[PDB]
Ligand binder design. Structure first.
Ligand SMILES: Nc1ccc(F)cc1C(=O)O
Ligand SMILES: Nc1ccc(F)cc1C(=O)O
Lengths: 265, 263
C-alpha cells in the first residue's frame, strides 16, 4: 500500500484468503476488522510512528481504542480484491479518530466504512488524560485540517449512547478464554477477539437467516491473558437489533458493551 | 501466485501482517499453517477444483491424517515469504501435499512442511482410502518422479507417535472453538488444533525457546459444541508429547510432538 498524493491518507489492497471467509463464503467482520488494523499499522509505519510519537514514548503514553464502529454493505468474496483507505483526525483534547472506507477494486463502489475513537492513557498506571498541545502538533501534520468523516450523517449511529444490558440476558455464552493466538506481539488481547466474543451469543437462527450490517462496540477494560469472559445478548427489535455485554465470569466486571444490526438475507 | 512453468507445482508470496506476529515479532506457526492451507487452495483452484472433485459423485472428500512442519526462521513483520506446494500419490494408501518456504530476498529455505491425506465418505466417515479409477483424474497434476520436502530415508515426519499416559505434566482444560475457528462448511479448521496443542506448553518454554518442529496426527474431528483438554509431558533442545481429548469421556482427537531450540 501507499500514502496518497497529498500524504494525508493511506491505501492498501487485500485478496480475501480461503480461511478468512465464514458461513456466507464471504469475509468475516473479524477478518475485516483485522484488515482495518493492518492498514492502520502500515499508515503509522509510513509516517515514522511506532502508534507512539517521540513525546508519548518519553512520558510512557499510549493510544487505546474507546470505540469501534463498522458498517458493511457487502462482504468481499474469496479471491475478491478489497481496497481500504484510512486517515486520522485530532478531536481536540478528547483524543484522536481513525476512519476507513472499503471499496470493491473492480467496481470502485463503497462496500463498507468504519470509524474508531482513541484516548490517551499512561502505559503503567492505566490512567486516562486529555491530549497535550505538544502531542496535538506532532501528528496534526499527518491529518487533513478540514474535517473528513467516514460517517458524516447529521445524527449518525456511530456516535449513539449504548446502555447496560440488565439481567437476565436473552442469550449467553459462558467461559470464553483467549488462547495465545488471541494475543498481539505485546501479550495484550487483540481488539478483534472481543468482536468474536460479542458475536458468540448471537443465536444460530439469526446467523442462518440474517447478515450483520452494523456493529458498535465500547471498550471499558481489557481482558487479561488469564481472565474468563461471559458474552450476553438481548433482542431490542425486516431488521433485527441486539444489545451486547462482555463481563468477567467471576465478579461480573464489564469489559465491553455493544449493539449489532442484522438484515434478512 | 501461479503454477510454475511445468504446471506440476504452485508458488505464492505473502507479506507477514502485524496481527500475524507473536511474542518475538515473527510469524506464529499458526499464521504459517494458515498460509500453507491458502496456497493449497490456490493450487487446487488453478488445476480445476481445496477439495479435488469429480470423485464427489460418490460423496468422497480428502481428509488430513498428519501435518509435519519444520521452521528454521520465522519471517518478521513486513517480510515477503515465497511458498511452493505440490501433491503426490502414495499408491492407494492416500495422498501427500508438500511445501517449501523461502525468504523472498535471500532465496534461502526458512521452512518445509508435509501432510498425509486419506479418502473419507463424509456422510459416514468410513476411511476406505484407495482409488485406482479416482487416481488417474488427479495424477496428471503431480510430478511422476518422487519429489520430497523430507527426502532423508527414516526422517522425523514419518515417526510413530505414542499416547501420553496420565497424569500429564501440564494441561489446559475447557478449550472450545468459536465461529472464527470454523471454515465455510462449519468444520473446525485444522490450524485451531495446532493452537490447542501449544496452549499446554509452559510460559517459561515460550520465554526461553523457539518452536522448530511440530508433528500432529488427526484421529477424529472436534465439533462446534465439543470441549477439549490439551495435555503435554516433557520427554527430554526440549521435546514434548501432546494429546487433545474431549473434556468429558476423554476420546482422543489428536496426538503430537514438538521440538524447541534455546533462543
Ligand atoms: N464469527 C462468525 C464467523 C462466521 C460467521 F458466518 C458468523 C460469525 C458470527 O459470529 O456470527
Ligand atoms: N500461539 C503462540 C503464539 C505466539 C507465541 F510466541 C507462542 C505461541 C505458542 O503457542 O506457544
Amino acid at each position: 500500500g501507499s500514502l496518497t498524493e497529498d500524504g494525508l491518507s493511506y491505501k492498501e489492497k487485500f485478496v480475501v484468503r480461503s480461511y478468512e471467509v465464514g458461513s456466507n463464503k464471504t469475509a468475516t467482520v473479524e477478518t475485516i476488522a483485522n484488515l482495518l488494523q493492518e492498514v492502520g499499522c502500515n499508515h503509522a509505519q509510513s509516517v515514522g510512528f511506532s502508534a507512539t510519537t517521540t513525546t508519548m514514548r518519553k512520558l510512557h503514553l499510549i493510544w487505546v481504542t474507546a470505540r469501534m464502529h463498522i458498517e458493511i454493505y457487502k462482504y468481499p468474496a474469496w479471491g475478491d480484491v478489497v481496497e481500504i483507505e484510512t486517515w486520522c483526525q485530532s478531536e481536540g483534547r478528547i483524543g484522536t479518530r481513525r476512519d476507513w472506507i472499503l471499496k470493491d477494486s473492480v467496481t470502485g463502489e463503497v462496500t463498507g466504512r468504519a470509524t474508531s475513537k482513541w484516548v490517551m492513557m499512561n502505559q503503567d498506571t492505566r490512567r486516562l488524560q486529555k491530549v497535550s498541545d505538544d502531542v496535538r502538533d506532532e501528528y496534526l501534520v499527518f491529518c487533513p485540517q478540514e474535517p473528513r468523516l467516514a460517517f458524516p450523517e447529521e445524527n449518525n449511529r456511530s456516535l449513539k449512547k449504548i446502555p447496560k444490558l440488565e439481567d437476565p440476558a436473552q442469550y449467553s455464552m459462558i467461559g470464553l478464554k483467549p488462547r495465545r493466538a488471541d494475543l498481539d506481539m505485546n501479550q495484550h488481547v487483540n481488539n478483534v477477539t472481543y468482536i468474536g466474543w460479542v458475536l458468540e451469543s448471537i443465536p444460530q437462527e439469526i446467523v442462518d437467516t440474517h447478515e450483520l450490517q452494523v456493529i458498535t462496540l465500547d471498550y471499558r477494560r481489557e481482558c487479561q491473558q488469564d481472565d474468563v469472559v461471559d458474552s450476553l445478548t438481548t433482542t431490542t427489535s425486516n431488521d433485527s437489533q441486539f444489545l451486547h455485554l462482555l463481563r468477567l465470569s467471576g465478579d461480573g466486571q464489564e469489559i465491553n458493551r455493544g449493539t449489532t444490526l442484522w438484515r434478512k438475507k
